[PDB]
Structures are given as C-alpha cells and as structure tokens.
Amino acid sequence: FETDIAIPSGISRPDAAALQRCEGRVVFLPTIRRQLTLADVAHESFVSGGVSPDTLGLLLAYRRRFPAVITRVLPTRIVACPLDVGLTHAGTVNLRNTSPVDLCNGDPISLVPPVFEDVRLDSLDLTLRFPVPLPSPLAREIVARLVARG
Amino acid sequence: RDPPGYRYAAAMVPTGSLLSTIEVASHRRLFDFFSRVRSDANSLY
C-alpha cells in the first residue's frame, strides 16, 4: 500500500538532486490518501497561527498526523507508505538515520523534532523540517536534558 | 558536482565484451559514474 505525493511543476536542477538525497526518511501527512500534494506535506503545512511553531507545537502535530516513511522517489511523485496501515501487508521498510547516534538491533525508536541543529526548495518556496529518529530510551533522557537546561 | 546517469537500454544490447575481471572499487578517479548495486536498484527500473 503506497501513497503518492505529487511534486508540482517547475523543479530546478539542484532541487531534483536535493529530493534525491532524502531517500529513506520519516515524513508526516494529515490523512492516509492515495493522492496528495507536496504543499500539504512541508513545514509550511502547519505554520498555522501567526508564529511558526516551536518544538512544543511540533510534538502536538506529530500525534495528530500519521507518520510515513518514504520509499523510492520518482521525479514526478514521492511514493510513501504510512506507519499505521501500510505495514501490515508489506513487511519491512528501509529507514535512514539523521541521528548523531547509532542504532542497535532490537531498539524501539521514537521521533524528536530537530532540536540539535533541512532541505529548502526555492523553486517551490518551502522548507522541509524532518524528525530525528533516535532510540526511545534516549528520548526520555535527551528531552529531559533540554528541559533541564532552560 | 554531476554524476550524470546514463541510458539503460543501450545496455541491453552490448556492443562488445571484456576479457578479464577488473576490480572497480580499488579506485575512483579513472572512472566517471559508478554505483554499487545490492543485486537490484530503484534507479534501474
């Protein structure tokens, strides 16, 4: 079960290579749907409010959105499968780390907004913030560190 | 940089055959485009 995120027209030449570099990465969408536009996918899609959302409001949307892991990237559409319905039929989907921290076998993996330190598409005027797939026992440490910092 | 991809259907009819196996991963700079394949690639099909 693989959805489609269509790229709108007018892609520059470095930007077809920029989206060639997010091959296996976690992306949030509103509703599982066989066709979807990229403007509903980007970081702009939930800047609702008058301030772009900080790390708190990032967390709230991540439980109201349904996480998908990108498969192959065709130059016309981004093919993805979500992590709630598409994975009972197809067994196992590859995933790329953006973490500074390596993964072991058998860990469970949560996601954190990019608090540590971001593909921009100037042919389309949007940013693509991506979550940080770190292992879940660190998640109750690292967020508890950064709250303890302030 | 550019690793520009080639055309895969001229690949289907080879024009000539090599005579000896040659280690590719030994180096990079004699070559122009290279990709290691885990027996099947996205970009092929």
């Binding site: - | 055309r7 895969y8 259907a9 001229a10």
Partner: protein, 49 residues
C-alpha cells in the same frame, strides 16, 4: 437558430508504437510524431522553400 449539431466520435490515440518507443527508452525523450517529423526533415533538405 439550430437544434441538431454534428460532433465527431473517436478520441485521439498518441501511442508509442514504432520507433518512438526506442527513443523513449534509449534516447530518454520522445517526439510527438517522429514518423512524420522525421520524414519531413528530408524533403526540405533537397527540394524547395
């Protein structure tokens, strides 16, 4: 002024049967009707203007 009009029936078929298929695969782009555009780039080479 009128009640009954004439409308054609069949849609248009733009199919890659023939040598346009080889250009789509090997050459990596495709002309709309190469079986005529490729033909009319020969008689112009010789005849007239």
């Amino acid at each position: 002024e009128d009640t009954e009009a004439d409308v054609p029936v069949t849609y248009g078929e733009m199919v890659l049967n023939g040598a346009n298929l080889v250009t789509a695969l090997v050459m990596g782009k495709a002309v709309r009707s190469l079986d005529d555009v490729g033909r009319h780039l020969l008689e112009m080479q010789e005849e007239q203007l």
